[PDB]
Design a protein that fits this description.
part of a larger assembly; 3 chains; A alpha+beta; B alpha+beta; C mainly alpha; A: five-stranded mixed beta barrel; 13% helix; B: three-stranded antiparallel sheet; RNA-binding; ribosome; Schizosaccharomyces pombe; protein synthesis
Amino acid sequence: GKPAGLNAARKLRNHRREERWADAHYKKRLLGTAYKSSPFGGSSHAKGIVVEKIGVEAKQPNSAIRKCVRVQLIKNGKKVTAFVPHDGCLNFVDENDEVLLSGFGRKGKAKGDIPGVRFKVVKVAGVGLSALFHEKKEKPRA
Amino acid sequence: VRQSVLADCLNNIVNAERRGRRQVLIRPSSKVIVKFLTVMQKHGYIDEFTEIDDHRSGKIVIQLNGRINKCGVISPRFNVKLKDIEKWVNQLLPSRQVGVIVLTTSRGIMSHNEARAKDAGGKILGFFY
Amino acid sequence: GRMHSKGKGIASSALPYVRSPPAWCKADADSVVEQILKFSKKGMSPSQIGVTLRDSHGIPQVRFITGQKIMRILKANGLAPELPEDLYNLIKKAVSVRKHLERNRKDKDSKFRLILIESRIHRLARYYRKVGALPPTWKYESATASALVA
RNA sequence: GAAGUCGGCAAAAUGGAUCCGUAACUUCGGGAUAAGGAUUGGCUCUAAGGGUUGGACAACCAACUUAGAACUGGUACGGACAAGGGGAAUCUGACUGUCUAAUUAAAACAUAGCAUUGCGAUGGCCAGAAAGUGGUGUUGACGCAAUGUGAUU
RNA sequence: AAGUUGGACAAACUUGGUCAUUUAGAGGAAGUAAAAGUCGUAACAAGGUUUCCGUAGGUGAACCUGCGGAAGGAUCAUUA
RNA sequence: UUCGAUGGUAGGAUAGAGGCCUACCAUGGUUUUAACGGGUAACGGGGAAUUAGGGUUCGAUUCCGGAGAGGGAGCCUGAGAAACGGCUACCACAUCCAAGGAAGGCAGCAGGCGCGCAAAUUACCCAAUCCCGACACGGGGAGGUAGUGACAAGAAAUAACAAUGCAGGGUCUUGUAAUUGGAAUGAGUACAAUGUAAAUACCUUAACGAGGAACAAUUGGAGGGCAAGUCUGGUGCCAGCAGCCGCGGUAAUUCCAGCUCCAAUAGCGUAUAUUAAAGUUGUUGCAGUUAAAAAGCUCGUAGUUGAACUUUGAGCCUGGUCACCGGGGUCGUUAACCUUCUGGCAAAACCAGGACUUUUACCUUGAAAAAAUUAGAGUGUUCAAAGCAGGCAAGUUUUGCUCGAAUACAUUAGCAUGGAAUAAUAAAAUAGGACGUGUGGUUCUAUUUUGUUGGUUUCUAGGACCGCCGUAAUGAUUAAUAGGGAUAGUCGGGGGCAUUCGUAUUCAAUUGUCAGAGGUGAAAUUCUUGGAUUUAUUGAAGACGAACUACUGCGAAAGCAUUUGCCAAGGAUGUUUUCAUUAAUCAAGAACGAAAGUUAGGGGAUCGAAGACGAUCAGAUACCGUCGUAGUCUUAACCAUAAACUAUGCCGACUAGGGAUCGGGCAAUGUUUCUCGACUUGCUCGGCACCUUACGAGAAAUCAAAGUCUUUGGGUUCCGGGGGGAGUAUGGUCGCAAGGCUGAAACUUAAAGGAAUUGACGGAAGGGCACCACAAUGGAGUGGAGCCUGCGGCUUAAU
């Protein structure tokens, strides 16, 4: 098994360092995937420019239209997808609305039955969510 | 090749105790083994043992009186300071009143409690309880 | 375990607990020394002569009577071989295998055995060089292995 | 600065030596002087590299190189002469070699390699009008004779 | 004092090459999420030619066959 | 390594050392203990977060050190600058312009644009801290004070006092109260006194100051994890939820609306980075037979690990706290502080003092060393986060006194004291040794005197060296159920070379004969009245060693099976044989390495990739039959993999019962055989294995190892971190090539996988049972012609 000598620290350290790359967590954290390959740069939130709206089909055993939106990030111009939490707000969220996006919870993995979605809308046009659904605050003029 | 005769002696003793045999034969013999056997015999875990003296490293026959749950060696022999005794007792010993850790300090081979009284650390040899 | 084999044989010799010559064996500790010197003058192996005193002469382990080993006695008397016995025997075996290999070109098993002997002879030579029984510059030679054996 | 022309035909440009540097590909042998850069005169010195020879040495005689420095002038110096233009691809022939003397030098022929065929001498192949005749053959299948393809992979 | 001859520090500019990153790029070859269809066991049973590994050839498709191995076999078994 | 990289000489320059630079001379310096290069989404540290221990992440940020003022470069002043709120030149920006020109740098304090998910006043003051200056007085966007914010931390306001029918409970006690009255009222409104440079805020404080809109506390959830709905209306696998499972196709506890409750509370939720979980990075502390993973085997270097033994036993006292313990030592056995120098003593050493590690690791302790931080001592910011202040004294309101402002963390690394257990190198082997008021001598220095200075001699004090001189017991650890080397009888389908035999297959000649021969489940193709198949003789070719052939042997593995001879070698056994630690493991590095594949030569009988034909099903294209290419054989060169398996690395120790089996040895007044062999029995060592059991292990199958592991540590290499993508692309490297070695990322998925159990299925097997099954010579029939009745198609309006 593992060496158990009083002067085997170099062997133990070298083996631990070499095998540490096997773990997905260590590999991700040290390869900088959260900045290079990720749509963000490690940011918790970001702003984007809306492109269009997509009714992505739901995988088995479900089948639904989730009124997601295709957005273009302001800082990079790349095209990604976003999810609208509130119901029936598709008419409220239009294109080129200067939307605000955040993560979903799995740190870069698809949610539920909809493949290709990792970001959700937190604020839209600067008015935010949770207000246009209860009619507490209306959208501003543009 | 035999790397440490103390490990073989303690493994033979614990194996015989698990089997229930009242006597055990240890080959070969060394001063470290004799000192370790003296420590556990003084603490009451080991009955009389006789050293057969041939023209070789020697052999030991030990009378086992039970009351031993496990005796083992700690390899490699880490250097143990005064403040490390508490950590070793927590890691190895069943409790703070049961079990003995044997250290080869500057003043000789003795138990952890006696070494703590001597106010001198050393290297950890093994444990028994 | 065997150095270069999977065997685990334990065959050896058990020296007696006594360290004294037998009662009738009045070897007088000097006639044996003269016999050893005569047996070494021809050039027989120290192990082989020790066998001869054990079997033909009836002498016990020579140390128990003479007080010194066979190698030590002849070294003190000056009849010391240039190379150690085990060193010389291994070089002899290595030389014989190489002489067989240069003739039989299709013996891969013998080539493997030669490689094992070369590893053994080098490790023994390194030990003897460290212990100082040989001059520090004792690089073993494959071409002049015939020189080293003889 | 090739806009000429079917076409860079012709000419120009490069060129010696020393010091840097040199890609794709490859049969690992090359490509390669690849490509791309710098220097070069004269004079005055410096250092190192070898021979015999009078009592650690030594005054000669008899010698050629290399490297470096300063100074100087037409910022010039292989000063005439001498003397590679280079690169990226396609078709084709492997290469060296050979031929239409006097219009065609090639992709044509040949080549090593590969493969096939006949023949064990009372024979195969060839020759002779005939021959008591000749060649292969001062030969014997690792040979001779007859063909096709044309390096390597 | 301006100016001038030499020495070094030398910013910065042209010409080329090398390195890291990015943006191109028609088009070619991959798998993953995949509209009906397509498709027979190649494998799961003796999956209907027992299975599988290495190697080579052939075949629209899993694949078929030759050689040597393993049972992870469907046999731990023929002492007469 | 030029145009300085390593060192030397000399010089220059620097405040000074220095290849800092220059000229010359040699080729040196670092590196698998990772040099060099690359990335850093890297200023470093005190420190911060998580908190059994060990560990992991962060440190832009109140302190210390470093660099910088858009980017380099150069310089003056000045002790001190390569200064930029100093200058000069160039580049990129921006700038007034009479187009001649001047020219500028907020990563300083406020403030502005832009990038942004993300961060505040173009406020007041030198009063406190300190700094500068010619200076008791000046200045300080250092610094202090205030202003806006959703968050970084610490303390509590949204109230409680009763009557109230009833649920009640027990004449004692809570509840909603479509209800009221008296109570305690604190924020605010506003002049006071404190506070402050002046103000804000704070403590005191003119007075006013709640009855329901009182002066309405919200954020998520109520299927589980994880707490709280089969309560009511609307949609109805849709809208949608949904971190995961999962719900939604009219009874929706999960969708959206009402109600209630649940966790938290001026806070709740969401996203991201990290920590614990994660014993899923395992040193503590993982796993490798079957789930991911032991390399095909062997050698072996760095590296790691390394058998036992060298001052020990006994008798003492002693001052000391819990009859113990820590410590100090001789006395002497066994020698008493080895030794160097010194003081006195002087028949040297005897006593004491200075140094005593050869050289350590290790342990203890000490010195030395920032504060802030952490733990923590003391102290009543009304408690607390705080702070380092404070306290007396309640009868004179006392020309004062009294405490503190600790302690630890330090050792990574360095210095030093004490100990010599554990682990390391040497001591005197060709004695090339302590040898020493030492038998003889050399050679030098004057630490001194001979007159102060300079020089030789040498009495003298001392360093060093030459042949001897026996002062003494003169010097070598046992020889490991470690290892190597001998030596004897052996043993082996271990290796190579030559060599002998065997029948089988195919082919050739000839001979006897004629109808079919081959082949398959059935065929078909092909050949055969020309002599097929068969049978008899002879010869040739190459391949291969059947039966004996076994839960038997050998070899490191791949593999090795005819005889004999030669050569080299190997294990086990026997051994009062020799050396003495010479050993285990391996990164790298090399030898061997089935079959198939490659290059050529020789050889090519059978089989047989590719291929050729004929049934076969619908299609066969594949299985089947015959022929047949490369290949199967050998020689000389290649490669380098397989289910290369015991799916199980190597060395060492221990662990239960039996019977077979190979090799060796020991014993038998046991059997047998023309001096030994064969058989049998017992013991032991070394192998291949088998049966039972499970103290023990595992998830189980199972395992004498896969046991001696939560009671986790004998030593050492290789390898894995969910499945795909993918052993794929790219890169490097070996090979002529096929290919071998090394070997990712993006993206996607909530699961793949192992063991075992129960059903189901099997063109699987074994027992059977049946006229809705067959056999039976079956009997009757339907279906064949025509009609009753019912079913689909058609018609209609309903059929």
